[PDB]
Amino acid sequence: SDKPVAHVVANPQAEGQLQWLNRRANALLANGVELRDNQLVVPSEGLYLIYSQVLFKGQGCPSTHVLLTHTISRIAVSYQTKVNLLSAIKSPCQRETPAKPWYEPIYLGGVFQLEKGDRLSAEINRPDYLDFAESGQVYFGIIAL
């Protein structure tokens, strides 16, 4: 099979940052897909499934409203045009402020027309809340249709 695919996971060695890596146990890059500057590089034109999941955790609810964001964006090689493909906002806290641990997952996915050389990023606003407790809760991937 010649189908361009990628399944990348968070690097535990770069805690405090969301750094994607093609880890030995459960991650990969195949059939031309590359991982450069924390981005997935598309080898050829066509429709692709782009999916992701990040998990936020904390202990108790502090001051004001904690806002959690997760965004998937595209950089086209032509005009270096950046566009938002998928995005979501979550507020984990609501009048707790005493403490008990909370969990907030963000999952995103969709089918998009990509061009050869396009770069995809999957970013978060609060890397300090990113959970590293288990092996495969935070991942980012592409599957050509």
Ligand X SMILES: N#CCc1ccc(-c2cccc3ccncc23)cc1
Interacting residue ranges for ligand X, rule: CB under 6 A? 49, 51, 53, 107, 109-110, 143, 145
- Going by C-alpha positions, the residue among 38, 32, 40, 46 that lies closest to residue 1 is 32
Binding residue (CB under 8 A) for its own copies from 11, 38, 39, 71:
71
75 binds its own copies (CB under 8 A): no
Instruction: Name residues contacting its own copies, limited to 25-44 (CB under 8 A).
Output: 25-26, 28, 30
Contacts (Cβ under 8 Å, ≥6 apart) of 47: 111, 112, 113, 114, 144, 145
Cβ burial of 27 (10 Å; 0-12, 13-18, 19+) is buried
The region of 13-21, 35-43, 59-67, 118-126 touching its own copies under the rule CB under 8 A is 59-67
User: Which CB atom, from 133 or from 145, has the smaller least distance to ligand X?
Assistant: 145
Partner from its own copies, ligand X, none contacting 91, C-beta within 5 to 8 A by type: its own copies
Positive/negative CA dihedral, 29, 31, 33, 36: positive
User: Which CB atom, from 45 or from 128, has the smaller least distance to its own copies?
Assistant: 45
Task: Give alpha helix (H) positions in 4-145.
Answer: none
The footprint of its own copies (CB under 8 A) covers 1, 3, 5-7, 25-26, 28, 30, 46-47, 49, 51, 53, 55, 57, 64-65, 67, 71-72, 74, 83-96, 100-113, 131, 134-137, 139, 141, 143, 145
